[model samples]
Target chain A: MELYVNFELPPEAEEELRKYFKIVRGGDLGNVEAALVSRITAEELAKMPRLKFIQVVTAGLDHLPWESIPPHVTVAGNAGSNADAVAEFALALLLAPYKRIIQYGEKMKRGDYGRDVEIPLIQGEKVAVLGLGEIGTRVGKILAALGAQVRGFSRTPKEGPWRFTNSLEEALREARAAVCALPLNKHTRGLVKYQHLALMAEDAVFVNVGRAEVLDRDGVLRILKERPQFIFASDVWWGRNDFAKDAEFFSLPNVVATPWVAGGYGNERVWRQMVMEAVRNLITYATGGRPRNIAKREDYI
Target chain B: MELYVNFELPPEAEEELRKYFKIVRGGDLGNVEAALVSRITAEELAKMPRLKFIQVVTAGLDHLPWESIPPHVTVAGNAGSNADAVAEFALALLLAPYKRIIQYGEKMKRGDYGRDVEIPLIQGEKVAVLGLGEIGTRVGKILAALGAQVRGFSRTPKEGPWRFTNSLEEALREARAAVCALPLNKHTRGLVKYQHLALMAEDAVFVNVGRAEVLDRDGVLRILKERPQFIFASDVWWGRNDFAKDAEFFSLPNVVATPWVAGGYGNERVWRQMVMEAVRNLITYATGGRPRNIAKREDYI
Candidate 1:
């Protein structure tokens, strides 16, 4: 079987994948029955009429043109594979501002031993974790272990250590800190509006690991400008059409932004795990089996 | 019937204390029976002839002259009260360098969107947590929950999520990261030597939340200058005569230093709890009950 791999793989991963199929990096994709990709375009997909399976390493399918993907093609998004890496990064971002890690750590670099900021303990703090996906659930569990009273919000209630809620308003209003990990889909895009952000406490810390488009951009800007104390620590910013202005929030002092290293970009160990996960799906499909987390085209369109 | 308090207390806590004793701030110590103090000189204790119990808010008794005080005086240091706060801050310090929180956050502040550092996931990383005190135990628990294979070291080993070890060499030799939470005493002052540090992984991260004196100062500097990848995140620096040079490590990019806020200094919420905890000991002694965490003179002398 011929498999089209669009991304670079380590020697170990490549060796493992080569066991099941004859992997090709480029050239004719006419006879390719399965594809493993990091980023693939509609033009590339048009060449593969025999494509039976397409596996994406990215957690979100928003970048892909859903309309162009044929209905006969089976596509699976590598969602939970990157969840640990993303959730770990989110936890680090979530703690930085609250603990003044950057503020003091940077000050020390400047030869100043000043202790200007007040750091609050995570113990007994009320926090809300939006979207009970793998990332959010992992974050909530760690926060809970740190003695935080965590309340998780998802469209459907989940059974966990936290008090599960379907109501976003109640979760935001009562929380001292909140983390947004909601997936970008038809149901969640622009779900958090100006009113929802307004409901948060004046000095609350808000963290977003999800897509930037899921939030009301103008509304987030207005709220940030109004409250200097309200910190927005995020792993992403305005993507898609405003992709070039991805680091626009960097101008705000209250904003702590990191380029999308959360999805295992810089970490070789995690990056390999993600590639192998997507390849696992490809292997399953090649061996007369079904893949997990198959993407629904309706979610994107 | 009169209680001496050397620190300011919130109205709620002061009112709670007033119900039991007549609390005095600064008058004559002639008639004082029990004293709640953050810091007090040996000269001040000489005048308090009726003083039976003295409670210090600091977790360590390093500041107080243990020999100058009479053996009749029951001196208790608030240890476990500040453990949660210290452990929480330690966690923040531990994550900052690995995640490049300060590096990217500072770069973004300067309108630069550069991703120069590689971030490794905490999950499945082997970490050594030295000391099994309240702070060390709490830190181990959170790290274990983050999926790190934690190895906690103590003189006396007991049960926990991570494997507990009695040998410090085994802990340091087999860790990707290590956190020092050992108390500064006769036995622990210069425990971590140059050779022990050299045993660690080449790209290891070592965090010290314990007193600076616990580590060999020259050894730490030598190891840091030798390996640029080796990171040392510390809350305390050289104490005693070298107190003024606390931020000297600021010259090294690998060093992440925070000025003594780990034991609940800047945090008002944690600070109040620490002050109240010391007062609870004062109440215990005044009401014919035994106080907890009594300082052993031999440990210091």
Candidate 2:
């Protein structure tokens, strides 16, 4: 089988993928039976005559032209590939507030040692993980492992040791921290509102590693302004545009914001895993097997 | 027995301590049979006429006037009370480098979305945990859970699944990260020299939750300047005197500096544990039983 891999793969991963298929790089896209890509436009997709399937090398399918793809073509996502990296980043975001990582970093720049500043640790604390997908489930497990009382919320119940609920209010009620890892979709866009924000503890820390639209922008701003004790740390922002203008929110004392780079980029291990997962899906589809993480076009549309 | 406690204690811990002895805050120090304190000078210890035992409510007893205390006085320390908190902080320090927590925070303040910055995750990485004490053990366990290969270095060999070595050079040879959790003692002071640091991979990150003197200050600064890829993150400083002056090193790009706030400070769990440990020792002493973590004068002197 001929496979076109658009993303860069490490030597070891490329070798492994080559064992299963006849791999080609960008220029030879038309001759490939399957194309593994991080991104492709509708026009570019139309040019691939032999393309039987498209495997996205990322968890989210937001960048893909789902509406333009042909009905006969199969599209699968490499969601779980970056699960560990994203989950670890989520954990760091959650731990940063309590440990005062951002505050200390800022202070250290001015030669200020914040020894007098007393902060709490996450041990034996309650945390609510919103979403039970690959990233969310891993975040819940890591938090639980760190001696936290973890509860999760998902659209549907999933099997896990921690308690799972469909109710967002129940998960947010008294949690010391809440993480939003829900995928960007119609159901989740602006899902978190003022009432939802109000349900969290006064001193609770909110972490978002998913999409910006998961929570209402005004709701977050209000919480951050009105409740000074409430911390809003995220690797995401309200919109994809204008990171420089977002400095207003990032300037807030209680906010520990980051420009979204949660998935380990430039890291060989993560890149290898991501490309390998995409290649595996291509090989699986070629062998008449169902590839995992097949995103339904309707979910995003 | 009459006891004097300068540290804050929970109501239940106070009640339990009161059951066995008459408790006084500070003024009646001369009548106390024991003193539970976080810090006390030699003059203060000399005034406590009936003080038979001294319980230090912290892992490090560097602040205490150990030599000034009478030979008859027995001192016990709450060494492991803040283990979980310090351990969790160490993990935060370790993760922050790979996740670019500090760098991203600085960039995010200027509204710079650092999508171009690529960092690695700790998964599949090897980390050398320099000490196998309570904090070190917990740190090793957490890192191992995060999918890192953890090795330990202790004065003597201890039993664990991961490899154990008494030689520091052997542990740092190929490790991507190294954590210093060794206590401040004659044996461990300036233990990590340039030769020891030079043994590590150029891209390795060194985390210090233990005392700053564990590594030579000149050697660390040299490494930070010479090897830009090597990160020296610490919760401790070489000299505890001036934090503002240490800004010279903290201001470095490769350094992730934090004031000494890794221990349990305002956290309820840590306070309760610290007080409970002190009370337990006092109770055990009154019952003619020996308390754990008794500090030997020679260990500090």
Task: Note the Cα lDDT for every prediction shown.
Answer: 0.80, 0.79
Judged by DockQ cut-offs, the docking class of candidate 1 is medium
| Model 2: pairs clashing at backbone N, Cα or C within 3 Å | none
Worst-scoring 10-residue span by lDDT in model 1 chain B: B239-248
lDDT of 2 by residue, A94-182 (tens): 77776776567667777665455666667777789999978999888888877888889999886474788888888888788988899
Model 1 stretches astray by more than 4 angstroms: A24-28, A109-116, A239-244, B22-31, B109-114, B239-244, B286-288
Could you give the TM-score of chain B for each candidate, in order? 0.89, 0.89
Best by lDDT: 1
Q: How do the residues A18-124 of candidate 1 rate in per-residue lDDT, one tens digit apiece?
A: 89998987798899986788778888889889987888887887777778888878789888888888887888888878887777776667766656778866888
- Show model 2 residue runs off by greater than 4 Å: A1-33, A48-51, A111-116, A241-248, A251-253, A264-268, B4-13, B24-33, B47-51, B114-116, B241-247, B266-269
Candidate 1 structure quality by residue, lDDT tens digits, B1-301: 5877777877766887887887777667677776777778878888777677678887877678677777767678788888888888888888877677766676666766556677877888889999987999988988888889998899877859788888777888847788899988887888898788888887788989888888999899999989898889887888532434755567787888777778576688788888778767767776777778887777777
Q: What range of 10 consecutive residues in model 2 chain B has the weakest lDDT sum?
A: B263-272
